[PDB]
Amino acid sequence: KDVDECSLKPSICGTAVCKNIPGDFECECPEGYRYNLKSKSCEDIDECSENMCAQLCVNYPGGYTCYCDGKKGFKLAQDQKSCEVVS
Numbered sequence: 001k002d003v004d005e006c007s008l009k010p011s012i013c014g015t016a017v018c019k020n021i022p023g024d025f026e027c028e029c030p031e032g033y034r035y036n037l038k039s040k041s042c043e044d045i046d047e048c049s050e051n052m053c054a055q056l057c058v059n060y061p062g063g064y065t066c067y068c069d070g071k072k073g074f075k076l077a078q079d080q081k082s083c084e085v086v087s
């Protein structure tokens with residue numbers, strides 16, 4: 001390893017069973033679920049909190065989703081990551 005694994009961010013995976021890297025990580029938590037040592041509980045991750053979605057990030061338990069219909073006010077393409085407008 002290198003440095004800062006499950007303590008790189010305010011709350012990664014409560015250093016439970018996570019495999020962190022210079023700029024990423026893994027965990028025993030479902031999917032890429034995030035864990036907390038404060039609560040010592042397992043909870044879905046914030047895949048969008050990082051930098052994956054566009055304007056809107058409906059991050060569901062496990063697999064996030066990136067729509068938009070916000071500032072511009074449109075819709076979410078068929079990619080489920082990028083957003084596009086529609087009339």
Ligand SMILES: [Ca+2]
Pocket residue numbers: 002003004005008020021022023024
């Ligand atoms: Ca690291």
Ligand SMILES: [Ca+2]
Pocket residue numbers: 044045046047059060061062063064
């Ligand atoms: Ca999630």
